[PDB]
């Protein structure tokens, strides 16, 4: 099995595997007795809110990384997912959508930011920038699969990543404070 997964890493082979469980960062797959990890942002082209149907199904994965030292292989639904996303990443790379303003669907929420799919690029929408308010948890404002319009603060071309912000639609209250609250106000 270990020789099998190493060749499929070299040969880019499609291997059948069973997803044994889902964790906060992805799904656990088993391939010929070797433990695989499917990243949450890499599970499917559609951010299907009902992930329960993905548990226990035999599905094919492409070996991205084989770790001899840890007995774990990181797989994603590759082959199929990589050529389409390169064209779409290039399209977003060429369009840049008036400073990357785009409707996006939140694939997964993390405690330091939200993963928002803009159709090819991964954005971290930080809890600080989800709203002007210092929210303790992103889960109350945006649910997995909600469409939010977010404005990009930073575009990382080399990693095909965008840093997102929601604050910029809400008129900056600090500039209003300069007009609302002079020094000395109780």
Swiss-Prot record:
Give the disruption phenotype, in one or two sentences: Essential, it cannot be deleted. Upon depletion cell growth and total protein synthesis become linear.
What does changing residue 112 to A do? Decreased binding of Q beta-derived M-site RNA, 80% synthesis of (-) strand RNA, in construct expressing residues 1-273
Question: Where is the S1 motif domain positioned along the sequence?
Answer: 12-78, 99-167
Up-regulation conditions: Represses its own translation via the N-terminus (at protein level).
Q: Can you say where in the cell this protein is located?
A: Cytoplasm
Q: In the record, which positions carry N6-acetyllysine? A: 136, 186
Instruction: Specify which residues bind RNA according to the UniProt entry for this protein.
Output: 46, 49
For this chain, the Swiss-Prot or TrEMBL PTM comment says: Phosphorylated; probably on a serine.
Q: What does this protein do?
A: Required for translation of most natural mRNAs except for leaderless mRNA. Binds mRNA upstream of the Shine-Dalgarno (SD) sequence and helps it bind to the 30S ribosomal subunit; acts as an RNA chaperone to unfold structured mRNA on the ribosome but is not essential for mRNAs with strong SDs and little 5'-UTR structure, thus it may help fine-tune which mRNAs that are translated. Unwinds dsRNA by binding to transiently formed ssRNA regions; binds about 10 nucleotides. Has a preference for polypyrimidine tracts. Negatively autoregulates its own translation.
Similarity field: Belongs to the bacterial ribosomal protein bS1 family.
Domains: entry comment:
The 6 S1 motif domains are not equivalent; the first 2 no longer bind rRNA but instead are involved in protein-ribosome and protein-protein interactions. Binds to the 30S ribosomal subunit via its N-terminal fragment (190 residues, the first 2 S1 motifs) and allows translation by S1-free ribosomes. The same fragment represses its own translation. The first 3 S1 motifs do however bind to mRNA pseudoknots in the 5'-UTR of at least 1 mRNA (rpsO); deletion of S1 motifs 1-3 but not motifs 4-6 is not viable, although a deletion of motifs 4-6 grows slowly and is cold-sensitive.
Question: What does the record note on quaternary structure?
Answer: Part of the 30S ribosomal subunit; the largest protein subunit, it is loosely associated and not always found in ribosomal crystal structures. Does not bind rRNA. Probably requires ribosomal protein uS2 to associate with the 30S subunit. Binds in the junction of the head, platform and main body of the 30S subunit; the N-terminus penetrates the 30S subunit while the C-terminus faces ribosomal protein uS2. Nascent polypeptide chains cross-link this protein in situ. Can be cross-linked to mRNA in the ribosome. (Microbial infection) During infection by bacteriophage Qbeta, part of the viral RNA-dependent RNA polymerase complex, the other subunits are the viral replicase catalytic subunit (AC P14647), host EF-Tu and EF-Ts.
- What's the name of the protein? Small ribosomal subunit protein bS1
High-level lineage:
Bacteria, Pseudomonadati, Pseudomonadota, Gammaproteobacteria, Enterobacterales
Span covered, complete protein = 94 to 279 of 557
